């Protein structure tokens, strides 16, 4: 129409990419996908309750962990209900619904709502108050549960806009040639084309051109006939073309298209270059950069389209099925699993390994696989196992029906668990052969159902659209779909957040880049900071905006006075904001560190695995006091990081008593904690929160292979909460497992070889946290494995992915694992500050 064009440009600005752009396409899959997603969008918009979607209660079905009954076991929960200037405390029973708090409130004094003080967080719906996230949050941080008796939000604001032959012959392909605008880097070199028919990372068969000398234009015009017959090409198979001289470029093309058609015609594919196994390598997307990218020209021209297992082998099948996900299946293992596929079908944990034994390059076999899939009885009734469900969505599976069953299983995850695996489900869209998939439809649907899932979905897709040329197209189409159903209100918030971000990026692109060597932040530099901000504050940066890593917090006016440019190299901005909420329980500002220059995706990955580890521990009634702080990549190499209220780095606690020396003293940390604590009640509580948090980061770090850090990369609160930071240093550009130094030891009651009531508690907390994570070996393995394939371009080999197997003492028993971890604690005590002193030499100087 007309206003429908004005809308697209809004979406385009929100998305950060134009989805109707067709300058880097070779078929209509993307446009076909924007079409396929209209249905599930509209099917969910029309399906959600307008009142509960406007209010997004954040609730859980999980048991209330035992470490929180140790604060309300007496069946009484206090809830401060506030009004204008009058408030009232009320005692509640863990099972009282927010609706039932008109009977134990209005009587003491029906169409009102209970909203949390200073937040867009509502306590409503037919749910027990114990099961509210905000409630468990206060209980955990021993906080008063302050709410506000106010009227519900008008759903009318969520208004969604509206809106409306040779079939059995061997497969062949012709390599016409390749061409690059420029190349001179060395002398004359040799070069050839490797064509692989792939399906879920396995080479069905491979062919090569003869090698020619490497010139601007290299022409072959040769047909390459393959060992697979066209009728055998499975759906989702990939023609992967690579250039060696060794591996320099690659591009992929789906053999079968989105409409079940075999691919026919001429093609000129602009390739991706390698910098000398990675999710980028599997993309069907071509390089948009035509001016400077290698291209390959091809021609495609084809037409279309119950004996029971015996004892001993039974034990083999079983020995196979119980192995870790990162264990190769030999040719004998595959034959066993396949021939006894009906036995294999009764063990859900065997699905990944059975599906990796299917000869996808033989259509009769695929057909039996589908016949097999039609049963599925057990799988349908199996207890949802996320680590198992994720294993079917990695790079090792390309079949749509296989991956669809994994999604079918995800359908039963509740909102708060979706929130836990969300980032990783989004990353997993990178392993889908087609743009429209059961996984993508699912994320569309969960985000459209719940405002909080929607909020994060938006940011996660946008960080990929902003810094991934390989998948931005696919992801933009998915974000547009979501944006077209989230609602007018949310569309308005997202607009406010994007405006602020672009405004902050531009302020940083001016102010930043005025310092090329560590410490140098002058009055001149700040003058400009507080100046451009001063221009912005003036009826420009929106009234307010939801905090991207904390959607329930609305940030208001910028306290320009409190802003500065941080000491460090990349010159991040230290921003301070007034909370636009008046009913907020305090005066405190909102501190956000806005950085440009770094891709923060790797950090989000790390912090989310941490939120995952805490979720595991909760199942085992443990609370390790990790502080996984807000961190959202918000655009190309830019982002928002949360500032934790009263924290400093471990290095500066050492620095502010000694100096710029590596002559670290055991005392200063406990000295800092006592000094910063008012009463002795708060000091003991802080020694205790330190004990927990320290154990927390020790295991967490070790398990992830990131425990060996300089103490400037570690921080603590005035309350004893320890926490790691900047996970990009290490995963971007003599050793130890984690960080258990004399100062941490001093706080716990020891120095070199001793033992104490706190240190003994520390050791025990570790072991029970480590062993709880081993109960989830397979799961942490597939997460890590997936994290390295989609999060970091470098660490992308079999070897790197293995690290975690050794770390989780896979195969060994809880007993030996107890020793293995105590060992580690021991390689730490047997080094005091060796390493900290080395990192000081290494990093702080230039050694
Ligand atoms: C870019 C940047 C890196 C490192 C910092 C550290 C030193 N400061 C942080 C401070 C603080 N009081 O300064 C408070 N909270 C934080 C939370 C997270 C990170 C991360 N990652 C750093 C800080 C700040 C900003």
Curated annotation (Swiss-Prot):
One of its GO terms (molecular function) is identical protein binding. Residues 306-485 form the PIK helical domain. Residues 167-301 form the C2 PI3K-type domain. Pancreas, skeletal muscle, liver and heart. GO terms for biological process: adaptive immune response; angiogenesis; cell migration; cellular response to cAMP; dendritic cell chemotaxis; endocytosis; G protein-coupled receptor signaling pathway; hepatocyte apoptotic process. Residues 74-151 form the PI3K-RBD domain. Changing residue 838 to S: In IMD97; loss-of-function variant unable to rescue reduced T-cell activation when expressed in Jurkat PIK3CG-deficient cells. It catalyses: a 1,2-diacyl-sn-glycero-3-phospho-(1D-myo-inositol) + ATP = a 1,2-diacyl-sn-glycero-3-phospho-(1D-myo-inositol-3-phosphate) + ADP + H(+); a 1,2-diacyl-sn-glycero-3-phospho-(1D-myo-inositol-4,5-bisphosphate) + ATP = a 1,2-diacyl-sn-glycero-3-phospho-(1D-myo-inositol-3,4,5-trisphosphate) + ADP + H(+); a 1,2-diacyl-sn-glycero-3-phospho-(1D-myo-inositol 4-phosphate) + ATP = a 1,2-diacyl-sn-glycero-3-phospho-(1D-myo-inositol-3,4-bisphosphate) + ADP + H(+); L-seryl-[protein] + ATP = O-phospho-L-seryl-[protein] + ADP + H(+). Residues 724-741 are annotated as: Activation loop. InterPro entries: ARM-type_fold (IPR016024), C2_domain_sf (IPR035892), Kinase-like_dom_sf (IPR011009), PI3/4_kinase_cat_dom (IPR000403), PI3/4_kinase_cat_sf (IPR036940), PI3/4_kinase_CS (IPR018936), PI3K-type_C2_dom (IPR002420), PI3K_ABD (IPR003113). It is an enzyme of class 2 (transferase). CDD domains: C2_PI3K_class_I_gamma, PI3Ka_I, PI3Kc_IB_gamma. ATP binds at residues 591-600, 626-634, 723-731. Its EC number is 2.7.1.137, 2.7.1.153, 2.7.1.154, 2.7.11.1. Activated by both the alpha and the beta-gamma G proteins following stimulation of G protein-coupled receptors (GPCRs). Activation by GPCRs is assisted by the regulatory subunits (PIK3R5 or PIK3R6) leading to the translocation from the cytosol to the plasma membrane and to kinase activation. Inhibited by AS-604850 and AS-605240. Phosphoinositide-3-kinase (PI3K) that phosphorylates PtdIns(4,5)P2 (Phosphatidylinositol 4,5-bisphosphate) to generate phosphatidylinositol 3,4,5-trisphosphate (PIP3). PIP3 plays a key role by recruiting PH domain-containing proteins to the membrane, including AKT1 and PDPK1, activating signaling cascades involved in cell growth, survival, proliferation, motility and morphology. Links G-protein coupled receptor activation to PIP3 production. Involved in immune, inflammatory and allergic responses. Modulates leukocyte chemotaxis to inflammatory sites and in response to chemoattractant agents. Heterodimer of a catalytic subunit PIK3CG and a PIK3R5 or PIK3R6 regulatory subunit. Interacts with GRK2 through the PIK helical domain. Interaction with GRK2 is required for targeting to agonist-occupied receptor. Interacts with PDE3B; regulates PDE3B activity and thereby cAMP levels in cells. Interacts with TPM2. Interacts with EPHA8; regulates integrin-mediated cell adhesion to substrate. Interacts with HRAS; the interaction is required for membrane recruitment and beta-gamma G protein dimer-dependent activation of the PI3K gamma complex PIK3CG:PIK3R6. PANTHER family: PHOSPHATIDYLINOSITOL 4,5-BISPHOSPHATE 3-KINASE CATALYTIC SUBUNIT GAMMA ISOFORM (PTHR10048:SF34), PHOSPHATIDYLINOSITOL KINASE (PTHR10048). This is Phosphatidylinositol 4,5-bisphosphate 3-kinase catalytic subunit gamma isoform. It comes from Homo sapiens.
């Amino acid at each position: 129409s007309e206003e429908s064009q004005a809308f697209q440009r809004q979406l385009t600005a929100l998305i950060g990419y134009d989805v109707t752009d067709v300058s880097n396409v070779h078929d209509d899959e993307l446009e076909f996908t924007r079409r396929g997603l209209v249905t599930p969008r509209m099917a969910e918009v029309a399906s959600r309750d307008p009142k509960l979607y406007a209010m997004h209660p954040w609730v859980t079905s999980k048991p209330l962990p035992e470490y929180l009954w140790k604060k309300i076991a007496n069946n009484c929960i206090f809830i401060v209900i506030h009004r204008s200037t009058t408030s009232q405390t009320i005692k509640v029973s863990p099972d009282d619904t927010p609706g039932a708090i008109l009977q134990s409130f209005f009587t003491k004094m029906r169409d009102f709502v209970l909203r949390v003080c200073g937040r867009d967080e509502y306590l409503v719906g037919e749910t027990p108050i114990k099961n509210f996230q905000w409630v468990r949050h206060c209980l955990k941080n021993g906080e008063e549960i302050h709410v506000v008796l106010d009227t519900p939000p008008d759903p009318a604001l969520d208004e969604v806009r509206k809106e409306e032959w040779d079939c059995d012959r061997k497969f062949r392909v012709k390599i016409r040639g390749i061409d690059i605008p420029v190349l001179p880097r060395n002398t004359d070199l040799t070069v050839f084309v490797e064509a692989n028919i792939q399906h879920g990372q396995q080479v069905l068969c491979q062919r090569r051109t003869s090698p020619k000398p490497f010139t601007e234009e290299v022409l072959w015009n040769v047909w390459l006939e393959f060992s697979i017959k066209i009728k055998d090409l499975p759906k989702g198979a990939l023609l992967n073309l690579q250039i060696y001289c060794q591996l320099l470029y690659y591009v992929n093309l789906l053999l079968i298209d989105h409409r079940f058609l075999l691919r026919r015609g001429e093609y000129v594919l602009h390739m991706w270059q390698i910098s000398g196994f990675n999710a980028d390598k599997l993309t069907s997307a071509t390089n948009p950069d035509k001016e400077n990218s290698m291209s390959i020209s091809i021609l495609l021209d084809n037409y279309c389209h119950r004996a029971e297992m015996p004892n001993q082998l039974r034990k083999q099948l079983e020995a196979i099925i119980a192995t870790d996900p990162l264990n190769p299946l030999t040719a004998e293992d595959k034959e066993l699993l396949w021939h006894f596929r009906y036995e294999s079908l009764k063990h859900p944990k065997a699905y990944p390994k059975l599906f990796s034994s299917v000869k996808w390059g033989q259509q009769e076999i695929v057909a039996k696989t589908y016949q097999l899939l039609a049963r599925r009885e057990v799988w349908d009734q199996s207890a949802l196992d996320v680590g198992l469900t994720m294993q079917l969505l990695d790079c090792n599976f390309s079949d749509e029906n296989v991956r669809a069953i994994a999604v079918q299983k995800l359908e039963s995850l509740e909102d708060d668990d979706v929130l836990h695996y969300l980032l990783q489900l989004v990353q997993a869209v990178k392993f889908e052969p087609y743009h429209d998939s059961a996984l993508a439809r699912f994320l569309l649907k969960r985000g459209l159902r719940n405002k909080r899932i929607g909020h994060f979905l938006f940011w996660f897709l946008r960080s990929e659209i902003a810094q991934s040329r390989h998948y931005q197209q696919r992801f933009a189409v998915i974000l547009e779909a979501y944006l077209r159903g989230c609602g007018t209100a949310m569309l308005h918030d997202f607009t406010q957040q994007v405006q602020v971000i672009e405004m902050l990026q531009k302020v940083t692109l001016d102010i930043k880049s005025l310092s090329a060597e560590k410490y140098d932040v002058s009055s001149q530099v700040i003058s400009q900071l507080k100046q451009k901000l001063e221009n912005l504050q003036n009826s420009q940066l929106p009234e307010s905006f939801r905090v991207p890593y904390d959607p329930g917090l609305k940030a208001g006016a910028l306290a320009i006075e409190k802003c500065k440019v941080m000491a460090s190299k990349k010159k991040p901005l230290w921003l301070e904001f007034k909370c636009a909420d008046p009913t907020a329980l305090s005066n405190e500002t909102i501190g956000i560190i806005f950085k440009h220059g770094d891709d923060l995706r790797q950090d989000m990955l790390i912090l989310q695995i941490l939120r995952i580890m805490e979720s595991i521990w909760e199942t085992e009634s443990l609370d390790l006091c990790l502080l996984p702080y807000g961190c959202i990549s918000t655009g190309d190499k830019i982002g928002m990081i949360e500032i934790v209220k009263d924290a400093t780095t471990i290095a500066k606690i050492q620095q502010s008593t000694v100096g710029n020396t590596g002559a670290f003293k055991d005392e200063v940390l406990n000295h800092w904690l006592k000094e910063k604590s008012p009463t002795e009640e708060k000091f003991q509580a802080a020694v205790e929160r330190f004990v927990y948090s320290c154990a927390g980061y020790c295991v967490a770090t070790f398990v992830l292979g990131i425990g060996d850090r300089h103490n400037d990369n570690i921080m603590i609160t005035e309350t004893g909460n320890l926490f790691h930071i900047d996970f990009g240093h290490i995963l971007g550009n003599e050793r130890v497992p984690f960080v258990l130094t004399p100062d941490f030891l001093f706080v716990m009651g020891t120095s070199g070889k001793k033992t104490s009531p706190h240190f003994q508690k520390f050791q025990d907390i570790c072991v029970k946290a480590y062993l709880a994570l081993r109960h989830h070996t397979n799961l942490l393995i597939i997460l890590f494995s997936m994290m390295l394939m989609t999060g970091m371009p470098q660490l992308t080999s079999k070897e790197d992915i293995e690290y975690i197997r050794d770390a989780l003492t896979v195969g060994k028993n809880e007993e030996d694992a107890k020793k293995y971890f105590l060992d580690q604690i021991e390689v730490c005590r047997d080094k005091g500050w060796t390493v900290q002193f080395n990192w000081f030499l290494h990093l702080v100087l230039g050694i």
